[PDB]
TrEMBL record, chains A, B:
Alphabetical list of PROSITE patterns matching this protein: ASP_PROT_RETROV, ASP_PROTEASE
Entry GO terms, CC: host multivesicular body; virion membrane
Annotated InterPro entries: Aspartic_peptidase_AS, Peptidase_A2_cat, Peptidase_aspartic_dom_sf, Retropepsin-like_cat_dom, Retropepsins
Organism whose genome encodes this protein: Human immunodeficiency virus type 1
Protein name listed in UniProt: Protease
Top-level taxon: Viruses
Length: 99, 99
């Protein structure tokens, strides 16, 4: 797809078999969801930095599908204002910024 | 240009005549800098939401140049961990996310 930026760029994504909406966020290193029930085992992971740490769950080797692009990636679960697709997943689907 | 996402997408920009590095951030509604000396007058703007509201400075009709594309747009000055080019500026230069 070719995604314009007039509104926040949400897409439908299937993650760990769960169908969700998430924002394509070139400002985020990692992909993170709240309110999801993923398969498999998780380990805790610290993200953020001083003044803004967050302890989240990290699920690895999770199947992710966006617009028919099927990849396997890491997915964090924890507090986030919106679900976020970060660079780590966007690089696997071959996404680019163009202008 | 066409920019891949293996690294954070920093670009050189000239904003209000000031040469800076800033991150192309599709998860940001607004372009925002800390530490910049913009021309003209500013008005207060409320930003944020659930995590907290804060008043920042809004400069309007500011010249912005990125990769030879010249536009005029809004630039906020307030706390941010990185200089950000948000969707408002990216829409004016015709940027899209593609995969
Ligand atoms: Cl959702
Ligand atoms: Cl980087
Ligand atoms: Cl800079
Ligand atoms: Cl305030
Ligand atoms: Na400078
Ligand atoms: Na102005």
């Amino acid at each position: 797809p070719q995604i314009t930026l007039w509104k926040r760029p949400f897409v439908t994504v299937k993650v760990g078999g769960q169908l969700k909406e998430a924002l394509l966020n070139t400002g985020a290193d990692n992909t993170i969801f709240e309110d999801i029930n993923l398969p498999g085992r998780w380990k805790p992971k610290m993200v953020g930095g001083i003044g803004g740490f967050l302890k989240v769950r990290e699920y690895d080797q999770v199947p992710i599908e966006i617009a028919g692009h099927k990849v396997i990636g890491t997915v964090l679960v924890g507090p986030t204002p919106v679900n976020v697709i970060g660079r780590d997943t966007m690089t696997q689907i071959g996404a680019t910024l163009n202008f």
